[PDB]
Amino acid sequence: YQNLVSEAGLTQKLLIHGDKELFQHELKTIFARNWLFLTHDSLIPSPGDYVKAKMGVDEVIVSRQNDGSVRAFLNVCRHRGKTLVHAEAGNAKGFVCGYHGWGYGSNGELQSVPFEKELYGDAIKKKCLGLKEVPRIESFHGFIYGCFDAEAPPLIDYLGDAAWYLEPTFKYSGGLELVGPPGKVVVKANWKSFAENFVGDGYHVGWTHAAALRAGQSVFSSIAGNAKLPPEGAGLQMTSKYGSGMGVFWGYYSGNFSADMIPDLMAFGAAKQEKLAKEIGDVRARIYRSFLNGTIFPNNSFLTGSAAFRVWNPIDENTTEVWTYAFVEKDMPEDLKRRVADAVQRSIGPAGFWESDDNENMETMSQNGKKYQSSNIDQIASLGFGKDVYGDECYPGVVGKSAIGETSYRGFYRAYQAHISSSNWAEFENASRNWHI
Amino acid sequence: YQNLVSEAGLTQKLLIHGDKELFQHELKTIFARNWLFLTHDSLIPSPGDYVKAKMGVDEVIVSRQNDGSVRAFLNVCRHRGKTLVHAEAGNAKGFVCGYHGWGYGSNGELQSVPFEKELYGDAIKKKCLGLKEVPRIESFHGFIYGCFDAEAPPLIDYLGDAAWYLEPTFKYSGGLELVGPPGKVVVKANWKSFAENFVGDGYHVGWTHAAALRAGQSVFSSIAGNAKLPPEGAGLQMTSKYGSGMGVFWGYYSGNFSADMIPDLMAFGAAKQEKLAKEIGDVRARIYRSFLNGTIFPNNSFLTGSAAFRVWNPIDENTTEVWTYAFVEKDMPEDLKRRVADAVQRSIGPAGFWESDDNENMETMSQNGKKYQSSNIDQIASLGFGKDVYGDECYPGVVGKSAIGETSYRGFYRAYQAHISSSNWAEFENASRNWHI
Amino acid sequence: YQNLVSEAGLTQKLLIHGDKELFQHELKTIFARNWLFLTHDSLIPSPGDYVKAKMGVDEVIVSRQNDGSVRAFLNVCRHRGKTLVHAEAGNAKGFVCGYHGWGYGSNGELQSVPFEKELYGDAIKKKCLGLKEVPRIESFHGFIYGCFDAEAPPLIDYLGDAAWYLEPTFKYSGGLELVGPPGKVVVKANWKSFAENFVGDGYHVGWTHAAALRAGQSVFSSIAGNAKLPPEGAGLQMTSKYGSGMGVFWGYYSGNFSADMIPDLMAFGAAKQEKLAKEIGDVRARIYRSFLNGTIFPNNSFLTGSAAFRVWNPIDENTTEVWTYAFVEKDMPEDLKRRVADAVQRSIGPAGFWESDDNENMETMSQNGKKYQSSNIDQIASLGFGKDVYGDECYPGVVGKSAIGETSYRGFYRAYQAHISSSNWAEFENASRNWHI
Amino acid sequence: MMINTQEDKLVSAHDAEEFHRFFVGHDSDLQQEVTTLLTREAHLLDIQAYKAWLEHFVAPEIKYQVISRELRSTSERRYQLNDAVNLYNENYQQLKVRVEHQMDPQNWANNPKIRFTRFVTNVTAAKDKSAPEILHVRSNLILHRARRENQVDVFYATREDKWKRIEGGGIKLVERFVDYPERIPQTHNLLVFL
Amino acid sequence: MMINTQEDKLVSAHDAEEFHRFFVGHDSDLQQEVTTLLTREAHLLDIQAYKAWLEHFVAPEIKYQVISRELRSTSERRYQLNDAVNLYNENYQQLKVRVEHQMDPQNWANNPKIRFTRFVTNVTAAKDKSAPEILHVRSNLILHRARRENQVDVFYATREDKWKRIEGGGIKLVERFVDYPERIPQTHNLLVFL
Amino acid sequence: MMINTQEDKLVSAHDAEEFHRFFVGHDSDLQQEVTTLLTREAHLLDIQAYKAWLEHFVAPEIKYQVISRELRSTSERRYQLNDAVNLYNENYQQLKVRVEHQMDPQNWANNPKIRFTRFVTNVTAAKDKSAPEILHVRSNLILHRARRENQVDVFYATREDKWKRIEGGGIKLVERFVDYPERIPQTHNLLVFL
């Protein structure tokens, strides 16, 4: 696994999107040790509320506790290993296994065991048979993440320099809500194909989505045919130590939405931008109403503006269960919230007319990584290479001066390679000591 | 493979129900060396009769010889390896390969070779090209088993202490008939999930099948909701050296059958019980009309009373071809035989309203054993642990005083682990020297 | 992999048709180093014409250059690895990637890169990013082959002694045309099952196809039921150093075609035979109007007379994408050409009434090679063994005196084993020094 | 129309007769009526109204039978053991039991609610020549069952029915027979009403 | 016919009412007319005449909606968050956008031309009791989509429609609703007109 | 109804004309008659009465054609080589051969007996405007073929037929054309009568 990504994350072996054994290895490194998106406060707002989430290939029950905290547990009975919960979301103070009737609390404790008195007696210690708990649960402004590795950095540290870019929308806008339920569909591509596309693929928009731009008249029509850069400027792209990165297209608050969404959305964003400029400054207030496309390492992606939140849930090396949520700013009028929720699915949900374009990009890349000769071809992530900066006065992290660029691909794959070559967090840190230099 | 099952068979790694490489290893140990159920005399009653059976993943032709014996052969032509027979059962004195026309006798001998005189001459020795024969074929009261390993113990020895429990129904009742054809359906679970359920899962009946108990009013309604033990007592569970085991629910001759079957079946069983008490004693005559649920190691299961005979034919680590037969006592009236045959399928056949309940128990257990984090969870087989006895005056083998118990799970998994850690029968025997202590 | 085929290619382990790891190994040896059929001049007759072909599991674009030559390239973009071309055939002077818009010439050169001036500058060297080219492209009388290994022998040398047998039809008849498009269908068998059948299975025709012979009244009715050899004689079978081989059934120019094709085809062939006898001699002119069934090592097969051209494209160890073309002699009347094209599909295309017979031969052989016990059974290739000759005055190569024979199976599997045991062409040559002795 | 079973070697005498029955029994009015009947029945089942189906569409004398036929050689005469296993062979009480099991809140398999979609085609009907209140009905069914996010099973069947006209205008099922076409269904179970 | 939802525990009040609507609304003439309408609509879609479909078969006031319903426990009362995501929820302009995207020569996914085949069955129709120009229509659809040599996706749906009679004789779709039966379709996408 | 192929960019001129043919050709009586015809034909095939089908349902002048179309770029004009391979292109004698092969006791593939189930939907018919004895018929077919315990293949097709009325009242197939929608079927073979 040592040389699947080259120095500076410049090239990647195509095999990474198709190799079966590497997928197994990712479960052990990538998904076993990194922060993985679970849910938002707004989807489990009341005590007893739960959702069923994936963490890599495993499934967890994510539950709002009676004291207001959140705990998550592997969705597996401690008796014979039956799956415990089959609903995708609900409210319950306990979960009963349908096999023999063991009853657990929403806190994971084994509370009731049929025939305990008559047949078990002291042959059972319920304290030792609680659901297997996810040891790390942290949030970023309502967005809840889990981690199987107790040694992981705090979520905020893990977000690194990416957090600064997220804050105008996620922190300073007055709170977001995640609108459920998500769209779900299975796509025959590797999880990394989606992750790299969302982390920094401004380059594909004008070409892959040429027809959708013409039809819907998205603000992205400016880059149609990859003929001209946006009149607003090339934008930015950034990356960070732990692999998260994103592009910024200035001012494009309506993102991949069609013309019918533009006037009302732009009016709402311009109005809050003026308020925000006074609190956080002109540049950051502009970021608030700009289009950010990014990936929170490894497999959680987002768009701001055309507000989407994605999880690329791995099934196997060429199969991914794609989740699509919309998010809204809490103080949007309720009609606008509903319109945004439908517009997200309309572009990038299971029946989205943009995302349908992407299938063949993702799927054939992944399927080519399985083929003997083709798998030895390198992918190149050279756009903007040699022009990235670190320690810029205005923009933190490793930063390129174009959202049409591969700065964030390079950082994503750098972090990826460091993890697959490492046995633990200490080794990752050693492998990342000079990540920006 | 060394520590997949703990001491006394107390715990099992969930991974055993999902691991691909372990499945391959089972073909080499478990299915290559143990006794596997083929058919009953009553399904191949006349010379030339044959059935097509599975032995692990392989297929064999099981044929009644002209002299009244039974031989079985791999269903593979010795020329280019085409499958020889496509019917599931029939009568034939020979089998001709559809590829080039080689003709074999029902005794496996290569008898005819097209163009032998003209083209082969002495370039062919037909004596060297007979079908590949199963070297060990033995029966237990009409039930015929095969084994690929010539070094296996005699079938009767292999049944060990389990044989005593089987004899009231299988030996002393005047003969059984297996009613074909079997129900067949593919279920997305590991073969072991079914095997452990039938070997001793009295615990699941009252919970998993609560709705079916309410609807059909089976005698098992007594344990509905796992609220109370049967008024007849907790019953028994036993296990044996080579892994076979079973539970006994006293008096429940109608088993999982609905109320419409109970009066006529109970009357028939009570009548023979009175006769049998004089020949084999009160206790054993009661066993005759009790419900036994068991597994004949590795993958043949049965219920007495609600008389069923099952084969869990492995396809891969999460796929099993489930066969369901009814059996009847030969001296039952023919109408009762027909009613029993339909009632078995009605509860546990492909459209059985009980067995449908079980799918999600079996399937999710198996699918959880494939998932990275979940596969490291232990299954626990602790029910009755510390209270099993050996060398009891009345009941042979390792015996627990409840059919709701995990005595037989522990023995099943003990034998399983001994086999996967062993290269041959000698090594198994060494690993099993103190099986009961 | 060392002893999968025995001395003189006499026996083969059935496992070879089912083993997953061996398939992976074949991609590295067999498909990475041998000549593989691409297309015919007649399917890419004009500059810019292309077809999409498979080379093992990989896909290539095969393109007629402006200067009249042919080049082929892996169908994979050098940027992020998306598949480049989705049409099966067409005409184009360039290929544009639908992902980001990179444009390649029909010569594989990277010609255009969107935003090159604005964003790439000197960070891109287009000369280094041309499509990955197939390094060896050669033809045999219009039939174009490719090879991934630059060290391969010239195609004509690779055909070895087989070329002499092919020449009457392929060279001396005035040119052939391949009629597209091919029939395509997926069959659940290993590629080798088809390859061995076509390389020399005269033996199966009379048995497998008994019903089709009776129905269509093909000239092959002579061998129906494998009862009698053809009145014309047993025919011939040959094999060669690099594995290609074939059988000859004298005079059977109409091959597997039905009675309605026989008079017109026989009249055309007999007429040219008389002309050809003057140029190439009686025997070779008779070969011209005889039925040849063969395989051009590894996975390209053909029938002359009932003129078919086949590619067994590997998908995995038990899955093959079967391509079926007809070929015609260029100077046949156009109506006869059309009748031949339909007749080929009628017998052996996706809806062919002969080839349908073959499915169960191929598929069950392959599926038996996956099964644990059955996979250890040997296939035997003994027909004609001990009677083959080399250096015959009239017939070159290793030659047996019957088209119902296994001479060519033995040569095919000898070459196969030499390749799987070898790391390169030099090692193959060393392993083949005494191939005929 | 009549089939010559001596020349048509693949056709069973049973299937040949039955084809003739339905050919000569064609009636435009009856075709429309039975098509409506089967569409209503399928809708009722799709929304899982099993009690309403059993009460209003199924006659007290019902025999509801689905068999799986053992695969035998077309030329193997001597072997006479029963070639059919009854996956279903239910009278009214047995259907009642199955319906109860379906609607019990402790049927764990039914939570979350399963989705059924039935496609009924190729409807053919004929009045019985003796008992004119009896309608012979043939129809083909595709049944799609989806549950638990990614479980999908598709069933394919020909239903050979006898229906009976009731005083008052209703029509109730007195026999359904299905010879299930896949010997080993790859659908987890066959716990669906075909 | 009426369903007793107290006894028929699996049936929603919505589905029960709707069944009754279509039962009493049966009309032979209407059945034939709507069957023809849906066959024409499906043919038009199969040959990819999306503009003709949108102009001639779809009304200006169209709501074209396909939902995916989150799987909830049949007994879990308290959790009241929205249980449906709109895979489609389109007005006329939004359909126009999707149709334009379809026919643009730079729609890379449409090259080579995709193949569609639609199977419409179980047609049931009823005139609205208030607005007699409104026709309620239920029909089941199997949609087979094939492309790129070996990609095949099969969709299964029940379309719950309202159609409107137009001055001049035409009939146009005013609402289509589909509760898509597979929570996680395994079809790459759902970019098809159901 | 007419399709504007300048605006409807995905529609072939062939498909547009054909849609119009069937739109204006609608006749209620004919629809019922042809529906019955195709149901009878499918039943006959399902029970494998191939001789009866060839004698009674197929005309002497039959052309029975199923093509597989090579996938070409929607914009690639210059390449003019034949784009269709005939999987079937049979006259009466060629069908006779295939039928004989089917019923021969030495057809090894037919033992044990295969199971066929055909679902015919979306029937549309129109009398020819010149030859009124000729009926143009379009119908969609799902064909399920099961054998050998766990082999299942499902075929999906649109049959474009011309049928001819016979003196005496029969109706016989004079042309069937199928443009098979999957370029590379994953069904082992296509040896079925569509």
Ligand SMILES: O=[N+]([O-])c1ccccc1
């Ligand atoms: O607009 N988009 O949908 C989008 C833009 C950039 C990267 C990924 C997706």
Ligand SMILES: O=[N+]([O-])c1ccccc1
């Ligand atoms: O009654 N049963 O069906 C049953 C009972 C115990 C274990 C397995 C099955």
Ligand SMILES: O=[N+]([O-])c1ccccc1
């Ligand atoms: O005639 N054939 O189709 C044929 C003959 C020999 C080997 C393979 C195929």
Ligand code: FES
């Ligand atoms: S597996 Fe959950 S209670 Fe037994």
Ligand code: FES
């Ligand atoms: S493979 Fe059986 S006779 Fe050749």
Ligand code: FES
């Ligand atoms: S992958 Fe081809 S241009 Fe980017």
Ligand SMILES: [Fe+3]
């Ligand atoms: Fe995109």
Ligand SMILES: [Fe+3]
């Ligand atoms: Fe059970």
Ligand SMILES: [Fe+3]
């Ligand atoms: Fe053949």
Ligand code: NI
């Ligand atoms: Ni019948």
Ligand code: NI
């Ligand atoms: Ni009622």
Ligand code: NI
């Ligand atoms: Ni509704």
Ligand code: NI
């Ligand atoms: Ni118009």
Ligand code: NI
């Ligand atoms: Ni047409």
Ligand code: NI
């Ligand atoms: Ni006749």
